[PDB]
């Protein structure tokens, strides 16, 4: 319903619709793991070496595992990313990197976490007011208001540095912040055009299941068919540079028309806060992204290849004690996303 002569004050930083989206995604994520097989039985000492290749991202590890009978044992070996494994005996002895902190649960292989868009709808007695102001900056009076019972479908995409499957700005790149001037706050950038990004896990993998108990299965990486190559993402180079030019033109509105803007890479810390990450094909990718933020913009076909790392034990919501284990994905993964925006500081 377009509301003729109706204006209202909006504040995206105090929007409890966001708070619910956050709260609910976490609750469903956890609910989905309740019926799945636990991997706490895998907190064992592992003997480990490197995976054969010519000259070590992947580890070749083995251990004494339980079987369907409690009094029997089997020798099990599998392939692991080194990022999920820690050396303890300073073959060398290793343990899974999360055994001193959390329970690890295997996600059921039959359950998809694809960010299928959903609509949020108001209950009786309530209504959702919305802006049609294409220049609205996420705060303050909104000159053109209409109302709905339900929002547009929103994909619950989980990411860090880049936003890969959201909406585009209607006209111009929009830059929004709680303050802009406050260095303690984030600046969110919404592109008015998509940037194509092509990500892959260029390794043909196999998977095997291990019966570790009564209907209790563990999914292990079998081996790699063909070459072993690093995961990576391809970003259109020309598009990216044009995109940054637009971002800079808009950023300058708050910094000065002749102010020089520089894009630098991230600060140090855990991969979850220093790299770009996403879940695609069932794998959790961590991308270096420094190739995207390495330029200075001064007033007056090709691609960028970003190496990526992959992990299987994920502390999904930055909580301690609840770790999810991503079972191996067979075959080769190819993902194409729309960069729709950035989170910058």
């Amino acid at each position, epitope marked *: 319903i377009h509301l003729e002569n109706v204006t209202e004050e909006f504040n995206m930083w105090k929007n409890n619709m966001v708070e619910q989206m956050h709260t609910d995604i976490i609750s469903l994520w956890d609910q989905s793991l309740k019926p799945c097989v636990k991997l706490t039985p895998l907190c064992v000492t592992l003997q480990c070496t490197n995976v054969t290749n010519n000259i070590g991202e992947l580890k070749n590890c083995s251990f004494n595992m339980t079987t369907e009978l409690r009094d029997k044992k089997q020798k099990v070996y599998s392939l692991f990313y080194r990022l999920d494994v820690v050396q303890i005996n300073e073959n060398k002895e290793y343990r899974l990197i999360n055994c001193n902190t959390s329970a690890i649960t295997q996600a059921c292989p039959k359950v998809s976490f694809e960010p299928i868009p959903i609509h949020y709808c108001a209950p009786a007695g309530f209504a959702i007011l919305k802006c049609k102001d294409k220049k609205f900056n996420g705060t303050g009076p909104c000159p053109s208001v209409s109302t709905v019972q339900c929002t547009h479908g929103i994909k619950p995409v989980v990411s860090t540095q880049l936003l890969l499957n959201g909406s585009l700005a209607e006209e111009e790149v929009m830059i929004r912040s709680e303050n802009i001037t406050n260095n303690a706050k984030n600046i969110l950038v919404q592109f008015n055009t998509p940037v194509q990004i092509n990500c892959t896990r260029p390794n043909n993998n196999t998977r095997k299941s291990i019966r570790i108990g009564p209907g209790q299965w563990f999914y292990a990486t079998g081996d790699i068919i063909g070459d072993i190559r*690093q995961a990576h993402c391809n970003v259109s180079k020309a598009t990216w540079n044009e995109t940054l030019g637009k971002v800079v033109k808009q950023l300058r509105k708050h910094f000065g028309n002749n102010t020089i803007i520089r894009f630098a890479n991230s600060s140090g810390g855990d991969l979850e806060v220093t790299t770009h990450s996403f879940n695609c094909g069932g794998e959790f990718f961590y991308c270096n992204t420094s190739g995207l933020f390495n330029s200075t913009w001064i007033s007056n076909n090709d691609s960028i290849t970003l190496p990526c790392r992959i992990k299987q034990i994920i502390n999904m919501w930055q909580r301690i004690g609840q770790a999810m284990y991503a079972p191996p994905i067979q075959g080769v993964i190819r993902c194409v996303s729309n960069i729709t925006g950035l989170i910058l500081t």
Partner: antibody
Amino acid sequence: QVHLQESGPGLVKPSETLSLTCNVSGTLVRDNYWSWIRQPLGKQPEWIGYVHDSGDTNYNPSLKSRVHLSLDKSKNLVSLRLTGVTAADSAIYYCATTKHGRRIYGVVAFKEWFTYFYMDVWGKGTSVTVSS
Amino acid sequence: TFVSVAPGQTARITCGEESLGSRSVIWYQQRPGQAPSLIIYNNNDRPSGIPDRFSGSPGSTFGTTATLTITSVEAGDEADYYCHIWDSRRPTNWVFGEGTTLIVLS
């Protein structure tokens, strides 16, 4: 046509240093990559190593501590020096001109490729044994 | 290891272990008393002077050994066929793989 002429005594004492020479003609030894190969009787050939310039040399790891290769551009000769010779080193030794190619399997920028070698020009070989 | 081929028949020569990764096979034919002579490099590249009857298997496969097909075998092709193999998932081979004698039954 490049002519590779392997030469040596054909017999070296046990616990002795062996030195073979390949007389290169029709090309400059410094421009080509050179390699040595040997073939013990009844066996398939073994690479010994390769030599060229700018540190771009390599050796069979079993002979790495025993073999030293050198190219003398002023004589246009390829030298092969093998120490510690024993009965196991009896073989026909060959001089060959090696070419280097490349095979790419991955991203390139991540060095997901390798160089491969093949030998286009071969000499006749020199049969060298080890004996009192 | 040998293959018995009547003149005009096709030789089927194999060499080496199964590929793990991308491979580059170099084949040489050594006539008795001669230095090995290159016939195929990079799986199927034949240097000038080498007949088209010599055709190698691709290096795109995995789980396979090197294979050389020699069609229309002539008495002059009698030789020991050896291969040297480069594989992205294995350490450098400083030696040749055991070859196959091609015996022409003329």
